[PDB]
Design brief:
little secondary structure
Amino acid sequence: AILSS
């Protein structure tokens, strides 16, 4: 998965 603010 990928998460970015």
